[model samples]
Target chain A: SRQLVLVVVFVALLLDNMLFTVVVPIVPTFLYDEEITRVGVLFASKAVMQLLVNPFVGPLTNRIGYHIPMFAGFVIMFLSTVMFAFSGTYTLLFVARTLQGIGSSFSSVAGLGMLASVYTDDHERGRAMGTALGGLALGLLVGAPFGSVMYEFVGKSAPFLILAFLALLDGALQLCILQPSKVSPESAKGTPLFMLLKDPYILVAAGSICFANMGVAILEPTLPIWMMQTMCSPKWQLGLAFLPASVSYLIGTNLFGVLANKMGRWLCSLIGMLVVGTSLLCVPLAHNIFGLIGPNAGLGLAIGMVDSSMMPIMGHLVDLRHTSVYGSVYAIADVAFCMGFAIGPSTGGAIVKAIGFPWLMVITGVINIVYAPLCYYLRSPPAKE
Target chain B: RQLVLVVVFVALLLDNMLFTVVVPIVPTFLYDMEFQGTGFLEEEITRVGVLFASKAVMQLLVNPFVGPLTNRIGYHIPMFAGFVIMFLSTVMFAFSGTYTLLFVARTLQGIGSSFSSVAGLGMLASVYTDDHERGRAMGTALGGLALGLLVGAPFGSVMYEFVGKSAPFLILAFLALLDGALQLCILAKGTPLFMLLKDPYILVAAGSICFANMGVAILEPTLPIWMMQTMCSPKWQLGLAFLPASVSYLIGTNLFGVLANKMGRWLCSLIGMLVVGTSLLCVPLAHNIFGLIGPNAGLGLAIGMVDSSMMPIMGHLVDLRHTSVYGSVYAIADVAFCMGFAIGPSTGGAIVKAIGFPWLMVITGVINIVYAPLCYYLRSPP
Candidate 1:
């Protein structure tokens, strides 16, 4: 049962990441002539919708077994893929991304919960979680290069068409191999959301994540177009940049895992944010080609450190003595991620327009900069007596 | 002396600014024929690429020789000479009417650049002896390059637009003469070492700088032209994009000076190059203005790390059991600087021709990505 579940979850995660990552490098080619900020709505809408859908999805998955919700989401995923294929107009792109985001939320919430339930044992759970996440990572790694290659050799819609087939395969296997499972994680009490969010300590961790989503994702919408201007990039090679970031992210998460344990999560985050803030602020000043590459890697590495520190630091700050506040805290974390990503590209486009790119990126980094010190202040939260 | 060096740096910047000014204009200039304005476009393409390489090559030759020579003759004389050359070149560019005359103007400008740079740095090197102060001085010098970059293209067409066609040369002629006068107030004895070129250290230093410039400028001529075609960028606006990079570059360098001073050169360069390459990688991936601006600035910051680290590492290398070979090392440094400029355009033109601009930049970034790790081996030096 455990073996079958692992295989099912891994493939599902793989399919999910592959579909998500494949289109990122190709969006620019399709919208070659579009204004830069206009391109951001696709990514922004998707991230925001994913956040909104999660709350609704949690309840839905609890009512239905994980299999049904998972299958339904995959079907939605397929529908969205098809829409993505046919999307030429702005409205169509918006709808396609909306569906895609909802699909992601449904699958992720149910799929992860289902995995946790099946592994009743902690050791087995750790092993399964690691492997399942590997699927996500490898999928991102493989899917991007594949997207570019298919784009180069195949046609524009080839990736989506293939993704449709992959979704079909994942759904079929989930139906066959999946056992009926219920979400067994701690549920949120009827406490207000801001009660968990009220603490300044938790806010710093959430705040950094918020800024990161905006700062990091802000680059995505127009990165391909910018690549074309900056480096004469094609669809295939444009995504080569992401690989380094991914690599450094992996290293950052691992290294900071150990470092945070030693020195505390807030301190590590403080260090990471300093690097992130400085690097991002510096990014606009690249004089030539090397200028772009170096800062990109720096941004990737530092952001990775921030990413590693955020979840742990926030979890540490949560003093769950009297009430089941776990749900509200998770929900708060979810909202931060959602708000950052959703508001980022939407607001970033206009803000970039109002203030200009240099000012916006600089200001974003400045916001990030404040987090470094706040992280220091938030070190060692005492229990409420 | 601080103010004087800044003025010298600005004068030096104006030279680089003017050189690339023609890049955006020249693409449009192809339509302006020596005969009827509607003839063959093929030959003109080849000529445009040729101008970039020839200018660089001319500077490469002139770079080493003039530095030491300037030290001998005093900075004012060479300053006068550089201004005279620049003044003449601009005049030719404005009124030359024919392609051949315009080509001469370009070649002359390259030669003129060699004199101004040698004169400017020679004076700077003589004045600042402290390591910390020199770092500050170099950062400002770097800023001047960014300012030139920010001002160059927009300055070219905006002024040339309402003013007469010859308006640019006339204004620059006056500025050049004023700059020449600025040189007369300062005096410095300098160094010259062209004959001791056999050292592998000096040669590698010179060679690397050349390739670095070539890599940086690979899209110099083609980029603004591509902007015009794709972005519908006006000549004045064509140069506006360069500002993001320059602004971030100014910030990057300022921050890097403090950061790298503690971290040591090799480690700093490694991290910096990792950033530089990654950001460039992001550049091609960008689909919109935000994509380009963020990553371009990202590039500035990371490359600032690389730039901040590069000189210190090279200085450390030359400091291996040696006296104050300031003139010799500076002379060799001039050689590297000159070759980078002279060859960058010509070779960059060829590179863009071969794989296309996108591929070349991607490849250049990849090279930097690889170099990031290799930088670690260069740590804990003799």
Candidate 2:
């Protein structure tokens, strides 16, 4: 059952990530025709809408089981993709992206929670999580090149329509593969939301997640723009920039998962955060693609470490009965993630426009170094099984 | 104990608000100074990165000894000393004529910041009883920090336009002094720094502080840049761009605290993270200020809730007997905070250069949100 669920989830995730990666190579040309300034507004619009809907998604999911929310997310994403296929103006594109953002929120979080429900033991759960992450990495590797090829051959809108159609197929797969189960742990059950509020460890976990997300979000949107403006290279080179990191991510997840199983989750998480922080600091010093490769790879490795360790640790923290609530907790992290994603790019882009890219890179690097220690709090004893 | 904790927490909160309000405005002023015929070139922005990082470097160097220093002397004295230095730095920043001067001033502010951070956290660790209650208290304190972000970024943006950059620093200095003075009056019977440092709770405090500061540093510098680039307006309009995030943060932080206190911090944190991730997915879709506002605000609120709740909980996680250890923990947090402050902006800037903002936002957001559940295993049950 777990393997079956993993397979379905992996495919859906691959399609989603692939579509996202494909869109990137085309976004700049599509939006910035006559004016460079319009990019900022267009970039920020999707994030803003996501923020509006994010706070509600988690609590709503908590109220309604994961499947409903997951399905809704798929529907929304499908519609958004269709809209993207036809979008001619910035405003229309913005609407399509906003709806897509809403759809993505539902799909990613709810889907993960549903996957989490399939595992009956720690080892299976870890493997399941790692496999899903591997699928994501694979998607990253495949998406950009695929998108670039499609853009080169078919019109830019062609990929969107295809992805939209694929999303419908994914929705069908989700319906068939994911089944509701009484999988939440006993400790997670009947615990009033108020009771959970009083737990400090939970707060620390939440904060750590927020901090981590913020760091990543701030970097994600900014990196691509930085490359385009500073690297002075062709569009295809942008995809190559991420190649080393993608490879590192794949390697990192598998290796880190094993290490995390031994060292315990918190320590692995802390170390992962520290490494990523260091890598972030290193990004600014990159003068060319060669310079960027090492740091990007390092960052990928670090992220893999964190990702490998996080779910297992979370499983230990809460009662098994209330595992569903984990979705809500995860949602909190998502909110930060989305916000950072929305804001980081626009902010970085603005700074680039106002000041320049080098300064922006320097600023982000410094911030990552400073934020590295926040992950340390995740180092605590695991709950007894 | 709770009374003392509240007093220190409130003071720290105020300082955070001030910091948040002031930091974002610095870049634009510096940019203007550099670009508006002031002989500053693109390379100078790299220098600004250095200047920004200098503060972190100073904080990192001093933080390890902060607990020891506080132990050897007293929390109130260090707090006071920190205020004085911060005041001088702020004043210097107000009148900075050259980049060198600004660097020195920022460095001094960092020194002062470290002192106050160590002392304030020491005071809180001394008063809080257990991990659970400490988390609540810490969360409330961090809530202030998040509030600062929500309030400070926009406040600085607006202030820079209205009152000018100098005024905000002056106001911040005054508030720091006032808070320091309040701490002195309230914690008159200064506990030995050694005692505070020995407590285990201090480690948790330190950890959370690092996270909070890192979050601040990464978001603070870049958010404004994002707004300016995306808004299709002048730099000052950056504040308008940040407004939604600020408001949402105000809501998210307070609500998270309340909910975490009720549901268990771990669960609440997970929820907060998910919200952040979802928000990230939204960034690529944004085309207007309104679109950006929702996500930014939601992000802020999520951060606020997690930060406010995390620190107090850390206070409970550690043993009370090792106050010095606890104090050291706070110092560690200071180091992380400084590192975050130093690294977030530069890395974010670099990423922007490489990927364009949307992909950067999505990738980072997903990374953050996905990591939340992992933390669940690390958290102890109530």
Candidate 3:
């Protein structure tokens, strides 16, 4: 049954995010060369909607119980997927993306909330969350290329229509196998969002995950520009630059969660941050395109280690500090990721323009270096309390 | 204990954010723009000072009562009520078209800041009993303050430039509303305001916090105009100008917070103040936006060092010498910061006008230099 629940979540997150990136190739085809800014808004529309919806969804998940929201989210996603298939106009494309963001927020929060509830044992919970996180990375890895290939051969609506079918199949599997009582409704008295935001433990854990994502997000905007300028790299290698980081992140996510159980979560997080900092500094000094691969790979792995460890620790924090509902807690995690991605690219681009890429990376690396001491303060709450 | 800390930190972040989000909008909005035709740039600059100063003035007036009130009533009610006030105040800012209304909104925000800050810090002291853990927790909460101050201007500037006036204010309104709602969901301290004023260590510690914030507050009003005149930088650059400081200040706070645990809070504070003075002097030397980054970043790190260390040191002194109740002492800290910020922009703008930007920087940098030695009076409370 635990395995069944995992499978449902894995597939749901997989398809939801897969469909998320699947738009990248398909949407631009519809947009004119002059309307590039419109495409940026279309992409950003989802994350903004996600951020606004998160605080509400968490408490709502607690009220209604996990499966109802989870299933509802799946249904919403199904509709959005269909919207993507049939919509040719730019306005509909924007709405479809926005709807998908809202839909994904509901599913992601409920799905993770469900996972946290079922996987009660600490070690097992760590491993389960880590394994589930792999689905996110896997989706990110495959989604763009998958969309590109499908759009090239089968055309626009065909790729999305196929996704719509997959979404339906996943919804049925979740409905049939993941029973309602699999995780029973509790007192409905979960910790409030404001209250949870106060916990130093939770804040630090949230910060760790935010930092993990921000490092990669920062790299995404600035690194490509740096590569073209410094190494005179071709467009293909620019695309390939982050590939090493993504692959290593996938491995690190699956591997580090279990290791964190033994090594301790904070310690693992600290080491990962150090590696991330080192790799960030190393990134700028590379003379050739190939030289960039080593640091980039390390950067991904470190991010993975940070995420896997911190995500489980966040769940454990709720179990320790508040009532049993994991919805609100995971919602905080989702907001952190959204904020990280939002702040990283916007500031990263502006800073790179002002100070140049090497200086930005150097400063960001220093920021990464300073993060270790903050992590030192992330001690476990007393058992007696 | 855990939940209380979260509430307090969020309240501070929201409040601190309220103080600075108007930076980019202030010069442009106040000077050349609408809401009745404005004056020349020089004449407009002092009004800019008064506009920025208004919130701090209101906070200063209210702080004296807030500390004692929270001590008597306990932290929860006042803190929640304060957030409610802040919410309405932010909503008022969204609709406020005229200058007088803006002042009213900012004054209301100051009243809200006073209650939330005093009660929140008092509540934090009550929860974390251990001295070491208390310092660490306080440092983390201060990070929220740092984050708020750093993020606010850019957010305001960028949002205002693109989306027009109400959009940025409304977004902040939403956050304030969310913060107030959060206060409700957690359905959840000590000393008199006057008596703590007698303690010399508290006086100096509080002064350190004041000087720390004063440097940035001074820059907030003056730097945008300075950059525009010399560098021909745009409005967005006005907000983005603070990014270097923001990133560095965040790093400095977290790093120095832990370092203060080992290096001694007073010693770290002393060093931090010195750096602040040096950085302040460097600011006017910058000919372009890029040059501003290095000096701005230095000021950020130095200010972070002073704040992260001094705040914890104030709490520690209270624990050691005075009654362990934190309301009044933190109130003093809040007042010190409010005074610095209040004086910074008002005088900073006038000073920039009278003596020009470079001399204002020189004078304020000297003030920090003179203030640096005051840390000697603050000992690790024996």
Candidate 4:
């Protein structure tokens, strides 16, 4: 059952990767024909939209079953892909991207929630989440390169339409096999959203996640651009730059989970943050790909630690009756994630246009280091018996 | 008590206004400084990213201790310290010539920001009791933040063009000092920071507050840059881009609080997101400042609803016996806010450079709309 669940999640994640990655390589080329700065507007629009919807996505998933949402996500992805394939103007392309983004969120939240629900035991849960997240990391690592290659052959939108077909297939598979979790009426009457707000530990955990997410998002969107300008690397090399981080992310999640089980979750998170911070500091000083890759790898490890630690710690905070609320908590983290993702690129672009990329990396790196010690002050409640 | 709360709200508003007034202008200054000094090397951009990211890094590092320290020492001290730091940083920034000097000044600002933010939030959470009342209070406090964004972006740019970048930072220093003095005068007879930090209600409040900040930061750094890229307008016009959202945010937050009282916090949040998403979708279609302004205003309204409703709801989740941790909750929010602020600009910059501004806006809008319905499913335990 766990394997089956993982496989299902893998498929869903793969589709997501296709949606984002398929467009990655062609984006610069697409916009090069238009006003260069318009690219910033395009990215900002997606980020702003994502930010607006993120706070509410978690709650909606909880109120309704995940199946319909997940199915709808695939439909949106399919439709968006088709739109992208046929798009003639910048406006049409923008519409296609927006629809795809909406579908991506549904697919991501619903699929992840399902995975979380299916993993009943700690060990299994860790592996399942790790595998699912790893699949995403892998998708990023592979997808960028794949999209570049495809763009070389078929054209920019072809990869998107292909991914759309894959999503449709995944949706069909989900319909045939996926089952929603059975919630008891007693459990269903769980705590109000207000009551959950009162939990200090949950708040701290959520805040930390949001902070970290913001940092990560801010960096992610701009790293490629920074590499292009600073390193004088071709656009295709941007995907390669992410490979080390992506691989480490995959490894980090599983490794951090096991460590969290043994050491305390908070401790694991702190250590992970420190590692990430140190790596970030190293980024600006990097003279070559090797220097850049090393810090990127460290970031992956740090992210892994946080990812592994967050869930178990959150699980300990709330009662079993309110387990589903965890999804909302996770969604809060997603909001931070989207915000960072949106903000990072735009800020990085502006800074680059104004100052340069080296300084941006240096500042981001130093900030990453600072987050390490702050995690220690968070007060974790003793685990429920 | 409400009068005291009102004073705190005003002080927060002032602090936010000063910060916002200075923040949007810093990049332009830094850009000019670097352009003049470094001649536009790749390293300069890297430094800018670092400068942008540093704020989050400092906040995250300082936030955990902010609660404990406020608890152990007192809110006024940190508040005072934050003001001093801001004052010093701004003064230094006014005269900074070299990249190193600029970096130091920026980092100091981040440190000051951490102190001001954590302390300000700690004080606000301390003043409230009932969940609904606390939410209203938080909404009021955050309203200042929204106002800061609304007024700060355009105002800073205008200020820079008129008086120069140095003037804005100088003005912020003076305002921060005034805020510090006010806190000292009021909190002189108040409860000790330790007592407040230990209070569980405070912790819960702080946490929710911090998370909300993450949402705020995501928009701050990128919006101006996005406007510049999207409209191909001058820097001053970037300020105009924020007007629509700023006004909407101010109105939306107050409305969100009232709606939360009537419809339930979760439902209001959900509906708000739907509106926000729709607004985001309209951004890509915008051809001028007016076109973008509508969507931005809608986004602001959505944020207002979520920000206003979430805090009080989180406060109710904790045990009544331990309300002191409100400082911790606020600290958490500060951390998130700082991080989001740091990350949002850089990420937004990168995405714009990679893709186009329209695609970015459209994607963001659609995702937000979906979030509204998702709010309905969130379950909060009693």
Q: Can you tell me the CAPRI class of model 3?
A: incorrect
Better of 3 and 4 by lDDT: 3
Candidate 4 yields a Cα-based lDDT of 0.62
DockQ of each: 0.01, 0.02, 0.01, 0.01
Worst 10 residues of 4 chain A by lDDT: A181-190
Question: Chain A TM-score for model 4, please?
Answer: 0.87
Give the CA lDDT, 0 to 100, for residue B33 in model 1.
43
Instruction: Compute the lDDT for candidate 3.
Output: 0.77
TM-score of each: 0.50, 0.47, 0.50, 0.47
Per-residue lDDT of model 3, residues B115-198, tens digit only:
777777777877777777887788689777777877776788788778887787777777777776666766413455567768
State the lDDT of candidate 1 residue by residue for A1-385, as single tens digits: 7798778877877887787778777775777744666766676777877887766655454445567767777888999989887777777888888888777766765666566556554334434554554565567668777887888898778888999898888877877887434543335433455465566776767787777766776765445445566566555565566576666555555455455555445545655765666566666655444556666666766765666566544434543232423334444555666677677667665665577666767666766654445554464566767
Q: Which stretches of candidate 2 lie over 4 Å from their true place?
A: A32-34, A179-198, A224-235, A320-324, A352-367, A381-385, B1-382
